[PDB]
Amino acid sequence: HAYIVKSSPGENSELKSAPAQVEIEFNEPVEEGFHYIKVYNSNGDRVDTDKTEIKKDNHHIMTVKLKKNLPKDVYRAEWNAVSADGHPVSGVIPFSI
Fold first, then answer.
1. Annotated binding site for Cu cation
2. Which of 61, 76, 95, 97 lies at a CB distance of 3.0 to 4.6 Å from 9, suitable for a disulfide?
3. Where along this sequence does the record place binding of Cu cation?
4. 4-96: which CATH topology?
């Protein structure tokens, strides 16, 4: 199974300014089909603003752009990807502004 190595925002992090994106780095590459990061505010509204992209030169990295000037709130980045080894993986990265 692929595992998160690191993310920006980090899990349960408290940000100092509004982020432009959510970025996730996996220990092994992840595949194109069905990947996503969907980001929600605490009202359940979507705050990502673009389709999720696997980095063109690095299939370990997945990013999604965010709406500008997000307010102070608690957020949930819900992610899904298919591992290089075939296993579907998913999770949530909570963070706050």
1. 1, 87
2. 95
3. 1, 87
4. Immunoglobulin-like (2.60.40)
Q: Three-state SS across the chain?
A: CCCEEEEECCCCEECCCCCCEEEEEECCCECCCCCEEEEECCCCCECECCCCEECCCCCCEEEEEECCCCCCCEEEEEEEEEECCCCEEEEEEEEEC
Q: How many CB atoms lie within 10 A of CB 59?
A: 16
Q: How far apart are CA 47 and CA 75, in angstroms?
A: 9
Tokens coding 18: 């509004």
- Count of beta carbons in the 10 Å neighbourhood of residue 66: 21
> What tokens appear for 92 in the block?
């949530």
Question: Which experimental method was this entry solved with?
Answer: X-ray
Q: How far apart are CA 76 and CA 81, in angstroms?
A: 16
- Write down the residue that tokens 């980045």 correspond to: 77
Is residue 9 reached through a cis peptide bond, with omega within 30 degrees of 0 on the bond before it?
A: yes
